[PDB]
Design a protein around this ligand. Structure first.
Ligand SMILES: Nc1ncnc2c1ncn2[C@@H]1O[C@H](COP(=O)(O)OP(=O)(O)NP(=O)(O)O)[C@@H](O)[C@H]1O
Ligand SMILES: Nc1ncnc2c1ncn2[C@@H]1O[C@H](COP(=O)(O)OP(=O)(O)NP(=O)(O)O)[C@@H](O)[C@H]1O
Ligand SMILES: O=C(Cc1ccc(C2CC2)cc1F)N1CCN(c2nc3ncc(F)cc3o2)CC1
Ligand SMILES: O=C(Cc1ccc(C2CC2)cc1F)N1CCN(c2nc3ncc(F)cc3o2)CC1
Ligand SMILES: [Mg+2]
Ligand SMILES: [Mg+2]
Lengths: 355, 355
C-alpha cells in the first residue's frame, strides 16, 4: 500500500504522501501498474484536477520513515471535492487509510465504497500533536520548522527568525481552521483541548465573501492588503478623543469592530478593501486575545499558531506577533510553523504501524 | 443647580436626573423660570425632540438622595445628537455637570461653550461600580435590581428570578457597550479593568446593518428573532456528522460562525433574518466565552452583564444564561440588572458632593 495520511477538515482535505526513493530493481518489478501510475501522477504534477495543489516548497526530502528513505509530500484540496477524490479511487482500485479530522467520521461510509479499503479513524488531538512534534524533530530540510517575528513592534526591523523547540513543553497550540481549537501540551503524552472559539478562518472567509463578493481566500487577502480597517472600526480615539491612559489603552486600539458601520453615511463610503481588512483584523485580534487568556490560565508562555488561516497570510501573522507581545507586556511569544496546515495529516500517517 | 449625572458613550448618552418632590412653598418661589421650565419639560414628556427617550419604567420613586426626597429619572439619546443637547443648553442658560464616559473628555470643550458651566470628568470605572452598588442597595422600588434566568436549559421552565447582591464581592462585571469592558470588583474600593474585547454591541449593529440593511438596533433584533443562525453558521455536526464526544462538544455547538457562507449557493439562499440572528449569536457567544475565561482567571463565579446591548434583548440574555451555565458545567452564573445601561450616569451623579 502507498503510505498516506489524511486530515479531512470542514474546509480543506490535507494529505501527506511518502514517496519512496530507495526502490530496488526487484521492488520496481513487483510493483502494480496502478501504483506506478499513482506515484507518477502525484510526483509529476503540482496541480491535481481543477482544485488539488501540491505544496512543493514544503516537501521534506530524503526522510527516513518506517525504515525506508523517501520524500514527504504535502497536498491539499477542498473538502467539497472529496467525492471526486473518492471516485478517482474507485476507478483505479484500492490500501489502509489512516484518516483524522471531522471528515474521517462524516465520510467513513464513503471511503468504504472503495472495495477492501480499511479506514482507521485517528484522534485529531493525537495526530496534531504527534505530527507537530515529528516535523520539528526531523527539521525542515535542515532548517528550523518553528519561527517567530523578531522586533514585531518596529516594521523596519520586524523579520522572520528561527525558534528552537527541542524542549517543547509546555506549549499552547492555537489551531485556526474553520473555527479555532486551543490545546495545552504538557508532555508527549499529556495534552488537552482547553477550549475553542467559533470565530476562525471560516468566519473571515464567510463574512468577507458576504461583505465584498470575493470568491476565494486569496482574493479576500488581496483586498485586505489594500484596505484601511479604521474606516469600519471605531478606535479608542474615536470615543475618547485620544488615549485612555487610566487603563493603558492606546488611542489606536480597536474599541468596537465594525463600530463605525452603525452610521449610514459611513457604510456608503467604505470600500470592499476596507471591509476585508476590518474582517481580517477583527478575527485575528479575537484569536490572539483568546490565546492570551488561555495562556495566562494554563501558565504557558509559548503560543504556537497552526492551521491554514495563516497560509500565505503574513498580515495576520505579523498582527498576532505584534499584538500578543504588546498586550502581554512581552510575557507571551507568538510562534509559527512552516508546515502549519499539515500536522494532522502527518500524525495520521505516523499511526500506520499500529495497523 | 439641577442634579444630573451624564455618561457620554460612543453610541448613547445616558442621563440620570433627580427630580425633587419635597419642594416647599418658599423654595418654589425662589426658583428660576428656566429651572421650572426644564423640570416641567423633563417630567411632562417621555420623548425629547426626535431622538431622546425617558425610560419611565426604570424610574425610582421617592428616593432619598443628598438629604432630599425625589424621583430618579433615566434618559437616553444618541451621542450623534449631543450638539442639539448642547445647543438647547445654550438657549436656556446654565450648573455643575458631573460627566463620565469617553465623551466627557472628547466633548469637554463643547460643554464649556455653556457659560460658567463647570464640567467635572469622573472616572468611568468609579462611576460604573459606584452606581451599580448604589442602585442595588436602594432596590428597584422595593424589588430586586439583580435577576437571573432560572433553569435556562429548559425553555418551558426558563424564567426570570431575583438574585440577592447584599454581599456583592467578588463580582465580574461585563459592560457590553460599543465594545466590551470586563471588570473585576473585589471590594467597594478594590476593582480593576481585567481586559476587554472589540466585539460588542457596535459590532452587532454595524455588521447587521451591512448584511441586512436594517436601520435601527430594534429592527436588527426583530430580524434576528425571525432568523435561523444555523443557515449561516457551520455546526459541529456539519463537520463531524454528529457530536464530537471525545472533547464533549455537542453537535449543535457552533464550530465556525458564518462558516457556511464560504459557499456561494448558501450565500444566495440565506435570508436577512438568518444573517441578523447569526450576527447576534456570534457576538453573544463570544462575549460569554470571554467572560467565562476571565471569571476562571479571576476566580470569580458571579458574572453580571450590563450595558445597552442587552436592552430589550431577551434573546442575547437567555443565550448568555444558558451558554454560561452549560460551558462552565454550572460553575458560573449569569446575572443581569434592571438598570444595566445607566450605572455610569448614576455614579457620576453620586460624585456631586465632591464639588
Ligand atoms: N485555498 C483555501 N481555500 C479555503 N480556505 C483557505 C484556503 N487557504 C487558506 N484558507 C484558510 O484556511 C481555513 C481552513 O484552514 P484548515 O486548517 O485547513 O481548516 P479545516 O481543517 O478544513 N477546518 P476544521 O474542521 O475546523 O479543522 C479557511 O477557513 C481559510 O480561512
Ligand atoms: N437605541 C439604540 N441605539 C443604538 N444602539 C442601541 C440602542 N439600544 C440598544 N443599543 C445597543 O447598545 C449598544 C450601546 O450600549 P451602551 O452601553 O449605551 O454603549 P456606549 O456607552 O454608548 N459605548 P462605550 O463608549 O463603548 O461605553 C449599541 O452598540 C447597541 O448594540
Ligand atoms: O479592551 C480592549 C478593547 C476595548 C473595548 C472597549 C473599550 C471602551 C471605550 C472604553 C475600549 C477598548 F480598548 N482591548 C484590550 C485587549 N485586546 C487584545 N488583547 C490581545 N491579546 C493578544 C492579541 F493577539 C490581540 C489582543 O487584543 C483588544 C483591545
Ligand atoms: O470550541 C468551541 C467551538 C469549536 C471550534 C472548532 C471546532 C472544530 C471542528 C473541530 C469545534 C468547536 F466546537 N466551543 C466551545 C467553547 N464555546 C463557548 N464557551 C462559552 N462560555 C460562555 C458562553 F456564554 C458561551 C460560550 O461558548 C464555543 C464553542
Ligand atoms: Mg482542521
Ligand atoms: Mg458606555
Amino acid at each position: 500500500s502507498p503510505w498516506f495520511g489524511m486530515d479531512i477538515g470542514g474546509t480543506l482535505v490535507k494529505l501527506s504522501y511518502f514517496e519512496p526513493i530507495d526502490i530496488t530493481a526487484e521492488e520496481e518489478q513487483e510493483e502494480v501498474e496502478s501504483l506506478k501510475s499513482i506515484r507518477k501522477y502525484l510526483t509529476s504534477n503540482v496541480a491535481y484536477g481543477s482544485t488539488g495543489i501540491r505544496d512543493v516548497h514544503l516537501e521534506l526530502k530524503d526522510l527516513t520513515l518506517f525504515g525506508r528513505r523517501g520524500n514527504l509530500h504535502f497536498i491539499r484540496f477542498p473538502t467539497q471535492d472529496l467525492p471526486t477524490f473518492i471516485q478517482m479511487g474507485r476507478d483505479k482500485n484500492f490500501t489502509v487509510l489512516c484518516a483524522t479530522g471531522g471528515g474521517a467520521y462524516k465520510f467513513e461510509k464513503d471511503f468504504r465504497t472503495i472495495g477492501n479499503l480499511h479506514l482507521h479513524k485517528l484522534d485529531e488531538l493525537d495526530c496534531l500533536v504527534k505530527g507537530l512534534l515529528y516535523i520539528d524533530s526531523v527539521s525542515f530540510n535542515g532548517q528550523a520548522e518553528c519561527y517567530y517575528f523578531a522586533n514585531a513592534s518596529e516594521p523596519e526591523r520586524c523579520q522572520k527568525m528561527p525558534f528552537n523547540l527541542d524542549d517543547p513543553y509546555p506549549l499552547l497550540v492555537v489551531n485556526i481552521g474553520s473555527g479555532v481549537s486551543i490545546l495545552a501540551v504538557h508532555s508527549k503524552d499529556n495534552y488537552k483541548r482547553v477550549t475553542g472559539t467559533s470565530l476562525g478562518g471560516g468566519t473571515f472567509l464567510g463574512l468577507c465573501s458576504l461583505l465584498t463578493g470575493c470568491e476565494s481566500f486569496e482574493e479576500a487577502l488581496e483586498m485586505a492588503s489594500k484596505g484601511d480597517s479604521t474606516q469600519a472600526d471605531k478606535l479608542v480615539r474615536d470615543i475618547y478623543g485620544g488615549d485612555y491612559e487610566r487603563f493603558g489603552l492606546p488611542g489606536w486600539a480597536v474599541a468596537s469592530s465594525f463600530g463605525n458601520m452603525i452610521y449610514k453615511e459611513k457604510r456608503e463610503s467604505v470600500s470592499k478593501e476596507d471591509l476585508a481588512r476590518a474582517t481580517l483584523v477583527t478575527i485575528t485580534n479575537n484569536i490572539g486575545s483568546v490565546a492570551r487568556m488561555c495562556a495566562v490560565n494554563e501558565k504557558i508562555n509559548r503560543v504556537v499558531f497552526v492551521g491554514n488561516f495563516l497560509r500565505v497570510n503574513t498580515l495576520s501573522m505579523k498582527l498576532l506577533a505584534y499584538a500578543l507581545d504588546y498586550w502581554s507586556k512581552g510575557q507571551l511569544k507568538a510562534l509559527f510553523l512552516e508546515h502549519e496546515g499539515y500536522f494532522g495529516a502527518v500524525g495520521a500517517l505516523l499511526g500506520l504501524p499500529n495497523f
